[PDB]
Design brief:
Structural class: alpha/beta
Family: Belongs to the transaldolase family. Type 1 subfamily.
Function: Transaldolase is important for the balance of metabolites in the pentose-phosphate pathway.
Strand order of the largest sheet: 1-2-3-4-5-6-7-8
Helix content: 40-55%
Strand content: 5-15%
Catalytic activity: D-sedoheptulose 7-phosphate + D-glyceraldehyde 3-phosphate = D-erythrose 4-phosphate + beta-D-fructose 6-phosphate
Distance between the termini: 52 Å
CATH superfamily: Aldolase class I
Pfam families: TAL_FSA (PF00923)
EC number: 2.2.1.2
CATH architecture: Alpha-Beta Barrel
Order of helices and strands: HEHEHHHEHEHEHEHHEHEHHH
CATH class: Alpha Beta
Number of strands: 8
């Protein structure tokens, strides 16, 4: 782009997003948006780098909530930590930050809505308007149902743990602001199931193909939901999706892209394919389609379990630091 790095070239055709809670690293890549999740928040808390911020948040919450029991206090500290890191991130980017609801409410639309609103309220109390936040929700049928209601009230959501086109279609039909189709975890399944000794070629990469299929689906149907590829194993997977609406990338891979200097060929583009529109997917059809996809059924469930485990670990760290 005047002999620019792959990272700089990529920013011209795709919205680059940093996938991290480590806000000090964000400055060296200059992404538009940033994304966090329970695993990334745990990592930012557990590491010594932001020990002061964590200590201050714990103190503040204890002081402002003297009437809460130990369990309630811990949950309140956990949400303020989520939001505190979100605010530090917003201070270094021009865009939005994604903050994820407690994974334990993934099968309850009502409590997902409650948690989403609590996150928004904590940001508001800290002087941050909702226009800069995306509430991240696991794309289970219940999560999509909750997002549908949240969007009607002007709360933008980021539907995550997307492994199947059926999820992506129901999300778009719910008027969701953005979806995070996973790439890497899909490729993990592929390599284990097929005992692959080396990484699959881009043309054969199940993860890259999933995002390409969702992108095509959305554009051909005129859905305005943002397609953001997430979870990457190498820069080649990211580069293969150049042109996608957005891509959220780890600091490790952003560093690699910053140091790559070959010409970037754009792969995903807009077409003149007359828009087509099908009937919305019902709960029963969605559940059947997800069941037919062994990988998606496993990885959606696993993703929720893993985030739950990391949330429980965070709670234990908080309890040991009261």
């Amino acid at each position: 782009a005047m002999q620019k790095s792959v990272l700089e070239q990529l920013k011209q055709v795709t919205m680059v997003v940093a996938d991290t809670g480590d806000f000090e690293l964000i400055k060296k890549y200059k992404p538009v948006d940033a994304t966090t999740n329970p695993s990334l928040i745990l990592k930012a808390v557990k590491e010594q780098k932001y020990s002061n911020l964590v200590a201050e948040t714990i103190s503040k919450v204890k002081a402002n909530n003297p009437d809460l029991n130990s369990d309630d206090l811990v949950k309140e500290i956990a949400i303020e930590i989520l939001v505190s890191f979100g605010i530090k991130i917003l201070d270094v980017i021009e865009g939005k930050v994604s903050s994820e609801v407690d994974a334990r409410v993934s099968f309850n639309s009502a409590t997902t809505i409650d948690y989403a609103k609590r996150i928004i309220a904590r940001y508001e109390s800290n002087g941050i308007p909702k226009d800069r936040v995306l509430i991240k929700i696991a794309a289970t049928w219940e999560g999509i149902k909750a997002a549908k209601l949240l969007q009607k009230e002007g709360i933008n959501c980021n539907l995550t743990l997307i492994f199947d086109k059926a999820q992506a279609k129901a999300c778009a039909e719910a008027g969701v602001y953005l979806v995070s189709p996973f790439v890497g975890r899909i490729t993990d399944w592929q390599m284990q199931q097929n005992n692959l000794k080396t990484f699959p070629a881009i043309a054969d990469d199940d993860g890259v193909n999933s995002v390409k299929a969702i992108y095509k689906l959305y554009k051909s149907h005129g859905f305005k939901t943002i397609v953001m590829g997430a979870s990457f194993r190498n820069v080649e997977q990211v580069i293969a999706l150049a042109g996608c609406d957005a891509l959220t990338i780890s600091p490790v891979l952003l560093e690699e892209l910053k140091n790559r200097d070959e010409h970037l060929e754009v792969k995903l583009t807009k077409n003149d394919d007359v828009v087509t529109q099908s009937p919305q997917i019902s709960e029963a059809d969605f559940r059947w389609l997800m069941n037919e996809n062994a990988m998606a059924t496993h990885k959606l469930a696993e993703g929720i379990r893993l985030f739950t485990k990391d949330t429980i670990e965070l709670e234990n760290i908080i309890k040991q630091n009261l």
